[PDB]
Write a protein that binds this ligand. Structure first.
Ligand SMILES: O=C[C@H](O)[C@@H](O)[C@H](O)CO
Ligand SMILES: O=C[C@H](O)[C@@H](O)[C@H](O)CO
Ligand SMILES: O=C[C@H](O)[C@@H](O)[C@H](O)CO
Ligand SMILES: O=C[C@H](O)[C@@H](O)[C@H](O)CO
Ligand SMILES: [Mn+2]
Ligand SMILES: [Mn+2]
Ligand SMILES: [Mn+2]
Ligand SMILES: [Mn+2]
Ligand SMILES: [Mn+2]
Ligand SMILES: [Mn+2]
Ligand SMILES: [Mn+2]
Ligand SMILES: [Mn+2]
Lengths: 392, 391, 392, 392
């Protein structure tokens, strides 16, 4: 029922700190003090906090101010025992970034965007952060003829290669996590899905330092299966971090509490992350909530919502465990042949010639007869939902 | 008018679709393959493609199979049509209800491979250069039913074998994985162009693998087709392309190319044809994977075949005119489209030189730059006016 | 729990009888005998069975054949005690209906469509059906210029008025329910959402005999809130029947078991239907499942899936009940001011003159103070989900 | 071509005046002076201007200021010859409306919301406006249990009835147009489509005074066919006004220039509005553009975008007329039987009795022969498109 530091729950300062100024209205909440955020999160059970440079230090603060703020923040982490597992840079808010940071058509903007990141990398290293998340929110376009995608990908790579060079030379040991999003705020953003982000990373100079930071709602904005995408990310060993939240399909980015959107997929996701090979989780990084307390809430509503994320995750974990431990489930899994997918299609040392000589794989194969046996998938699915519902 | 240099190809199953849908009986009778070859030759197609089962009915004995192939070859011969690509039906028969290569049942997986090997031999025999693989039954309706990790291992296992075989026999085939987000399965493995490219990078001979993206498949997720093709070209993995029309996220419509998202059909033709030199950015077949609407008879079928070609040639013409317009050149200059091609760093500059440049940060006036407009709407308006023949 | 006839669970013969021939493949199951379907349904607790004319009597059966089928059917009904609460007509399968039934551009098709329905109304009336469901699956277009919508709505209305007339005159006492669907099989279908159907119904000669038959996946295909659209249908008093199933947002029509798609919306739907005003349900017609056993299943999976629909409804019902009887939930509802929406805005006898005179409604209204109070919506949503999860 | 006042192109002050502060970044343009707006629009060809109360007069302006602004505003109109065809009220920006205006759970907010509109009605009547647009952007919910939809529709109706009462008694002669939108800013907005809005309006006390104001993007946000919904709206006679813009399916509300989103559907929409019966337009109200100049643009891009809206409409208009006048199209329309849909299904004086007596409509009908003939829809669509491309 209660969270432990071993759970690795983290929250972005920009989450609980969201003032609720949306596209159609003014802020409904006052600004949250970074120091206070540190104490309340520590208090609800979080193990770490994350932030955008501009979330902690107001864009344009002098070094005197900047330094003061960092010192205070640092104290709070100290007193509470919270760590900073990841940091990110704001390359989307200021008007200069209206056509992107790393991929702006304007060369000067591109030089400036890199500088802004190098700086944040420095603070990150000083606070002990291990991951740099890159969300290229303005990289993309509203009109096709406005952006040369090829040139854009060259420029994205150019910037990223420099960042790895630097981290490596300074010995920061950072890992870089590219965050995919299909749209909002640009009409279409470059690297729209977890798949596009993985393919791209494979083309960098030191690909081993790069992975992705997929977000629940981002994949759901395209009506994709989040769990299946994570599974693919895991297969590639590129799941460097993860943003959990809720969404209701293809519409604006809702950023609801984790599990308040597609509940069934929230369940299969916890099951995937926690019931890894041999008991152990399949994923070891932070369970980071990138969500927003609804505009209708006050600070009470804010802390409630922060705890709801933790709660949802632990209730789901609990049922995922019980689902897998149930002998009846175990029996249905067997009947559906789920584990049979783990056995190689080919026998040991078997190649094309041995397979071509096997009459049982074609010539004497009774396709009609195998075609008629059911897989028992509805029943396995029903057992999963009953565990989810606390009915089994 | 189409020329063989335009490289328009059609699948046997497009004009031959009987229009039996999820809710109704077929409204057209079967199309004869020899007949299809002659009719397509006539409308300007340079090539024809087919799934094994479109040409040779599932379960035909060798004599029968052999007869059909011989007739087909003769038709090819007489018309001068080629077979640029072949594919395998791993989705129709009940045995494939949970997948071909990734079925939970090991025996189906083994059978799926034998079915493809056989089609590879025929493709090789017909001179095909590309093997398209559409894993339409690979995926699931429920998350607990499919171990995705094991599924990718098995998908990989099967493809490495296919490459081994092609390479040992000297077939020279290229393999193009075709992504689709859903339908017939709730969720299909390798759902977008991105997922398929990322996957291909993990096979044993990656240089032999690429993708076969379909306009409608990316649009079913509301993705920018042109933008995904641009990324595929950047990775150099555009091995083939399936063109058609779609109206956003709904069942797969397979309309004629350009009958769904017209603006994106226009930017797509511009991308493929107004390539690097002056030359096309893509040199493969312009394959139409579409379906003549169920409301049409055979006159409708041939009309729809021609409409695909017409749409492409009309778009190509306006794409060319768009690029040659001085007013467009001017707008491209104001929007700094070309400035994106200049490296961010000066030659020989690294992080140490960038950090020493006070003008890239310390003395950079972001406020001032942030106020200048890119003039992107205006550029967009000139493009649309070229499309409408308004200029 | 166990279903009782009071639960009024019904299934279409075409649900458990779907042979699983989809758009990309052959049938994976053999045909189900109607009599056998009656027996099996009765055995799992269904109270009724429904059917399309063509599901029971093969298209073009001679009168002797048709009569034979009907008689055997009636005996099964008799023997099992199942009823036929609704009947429907297939105006979509045969090639003649490729451009629609009532709205085909071809006049002779429109005339035939009406006669096919009149014939089904007769059989409906003889079996005791009270509702005739109309699903115009082929009414629409793939291209905008191919169909005059205004003319199409005129012809639709022309056919429906005749049907009401005939029924009225024969004393059949049928109620008509138009079933909306956005697309599939046509690119765009006329009367795409529950809203469009209701607005249409209001224009017929006798609106009182007309309502809608909304389906969970159909509204979800447009990514609309099914519960909220049902709430509006109930407000209008036009919910004549309902089709329950599962869907995963905008994609082909999945027709999964009820609750296997958007679980959270399924939960709020059961709450709305059963926890109606004054203790009792807000809706009393059949709880009809218009779903399809997945193509991967055999006849065992088919009955499993039929039972899963009922189980799903009963489990959510139980949790909806517990939700509302929870003093904490009640306390959250009061804090969120849900019930306060039920109090008129105007005081009894107050008009604009009086409203205009109330300085507390404007001149002395402190918008800023009210604007800062939180509604507690997240917390209320969390308690709801904790009930569904059986965590409370 | 060139716009004339007879084209009736109108624009909201908030359109060209949008400063470009989005959900993720700061404003990229300075504020637009209303008088300048009047002058600039007059210059590009607009015949009228519209606005929300708060667009013109800053929220919380003293009487003198308010009065001051209006007077200058009227001079500019005077000087330029522009009119104010429609007025609307902002019930979505201020924090007090976070849960809605008319249907806020909070009764005091509902009363305030009504007062705010009454005042705008007065200003509207004074400026000569004919239509009051009502966009309930905050009416809806993020969570199902937080909003009683039935009570919300009662409260919505209660507010609308009062407004009609007031206008009629003051002799303002306004018509009311409800604007549907599926989501954004609420997770789900009440009256999500043109359909639901029409159904609702039919339940008001003086339904003849209420219609709808559908927006292209709003219907496309749910992937619906805008042209077909407008055709239904015209069938019902409820198209009181229309908002024209562009959108790229189900995603955040883009508000692109008209015809910059779904070009094919913008084409068919212009054809429907202009190639009306008796040669004349089927719609005679304002052609209002509710769009936003992209965030990447400056004031020059702003006027460019304003003009693009007009050029798009006139270029499309020009091609719709050519299309209809083409003999080959006339031949295709005939083969597709588009016009045969206009001839009643029944012969004059025929009812069910005579239809039942017609063996040719059923007993002797050859469904198979009819089912084999094609409609030539593809050819007809190809011709429409070639006209759109200026290829014919
Ligand atoms: O859509 C917003 C993104 O999810 C953002 O919060 C990042 O993760 C950090 O820049
Ligand atoms: O959705 C169907 C696929 O597009 C298929 O036709 C492949 O391209 C070849 O099997
Ligand atoms: O999508 C098909 C429809 O839902 C159908 O089953 C109707 O409910 C009755 O013809
Ligand atoms: O999405 C915003 C609405 O379209 C708004 O502009 C209304 O039309 C006027 O309140
Ligand atoms: Mn997000
Ligand atoms: Mn994120
Ligand atoms: Mn397709
Ligand atoms: Mn294809
Ligand atoms: Mn359905
Ligand atoms: Mn149904
Ligand atoms: Mn809008
Ligand atoms: Mn609007």
């Amino acid at each position: 029922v209660q969270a432990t530091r071993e759970d690795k729950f983290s929250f972005g300062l920009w989450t609980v700190g969201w003032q609720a100024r949306d596209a159609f209205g003014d802020a409904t909440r006052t600004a949250l003090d970074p120091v206070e955020a540190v104490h309340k999160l520590a208090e609800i059970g979080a193990y770490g906090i994350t932030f955008h440079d501009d979330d902690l230090v107001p864009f344009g603060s002098d070094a005197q101010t900047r330094d003061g703020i960092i010192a205070g923040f640092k104290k709070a982490l100290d007193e509470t025992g919270l760590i900073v597992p990841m940091v990110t840079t704001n390359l989307f808010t200021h008007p200069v970034f209206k056509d992107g940071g790393f991929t702006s058509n304007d060369r000067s903007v591109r030089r400036y965007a890199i500088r802004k990141v190098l700086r944040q990398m420095d603070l990150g290293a000083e606070l002990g952060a291990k991951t740099l998340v890159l969300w290229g929110g303005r990289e993309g376009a509203e009109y096709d003829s406005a952006k040369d995608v090829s040139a854009a990908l060259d420029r994205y790579r150019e910037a990223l290669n420099l960042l790895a060079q630097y981290s490596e030379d300074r010995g920061y040991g950072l890992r870089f996590a590219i965050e995919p999003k299909p749209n909002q705020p640009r009409g279409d953003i470059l690297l729209p899905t977890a798949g596009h982000a993985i393919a791209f990373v494979q083309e960098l100079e030191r690909p081993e330092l790069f992975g992705i930071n997929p977000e629940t709602g981002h994949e759901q904005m395209s009506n994709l299966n989040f769990t299946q995408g994570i599974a693919q990310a895991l297969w590639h060993k590129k799941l460097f971090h993860i943003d959990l939240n809720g969404q209701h399909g293809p519409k604006f980015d809702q950023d609801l509490v984790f599990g308040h959107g597609d509940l069934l997929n929230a369940f299969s996701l916890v099951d995937l992350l926690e019931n890894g090979p041999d008991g152990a989780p399949a994923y070891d990084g932070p369970r980071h909530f990138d969500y927003k307390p609804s505009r209708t809430e006050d600070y009470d509503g804010v802390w409630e919502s922060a705890k709801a994320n933790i709660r949802m995750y632990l209730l789901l974990k609990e049922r995922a465990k019980a689902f897998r431990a149930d002998p009846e489930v175990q029996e249905a899994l067997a009947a559906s042949k789920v584990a049979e997918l783990k056995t190689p299609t080919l026998n040991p040392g078997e190649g094309y010639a041995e397979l071509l000589a096997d009459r049982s794989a074609f010539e004497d194969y009774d396709a009609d007869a195998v075609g008629a046996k059911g897989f028992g998938f509805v029943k396995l699915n029903q057992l999963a939902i009953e565990h989810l519902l606390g009915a089994r």
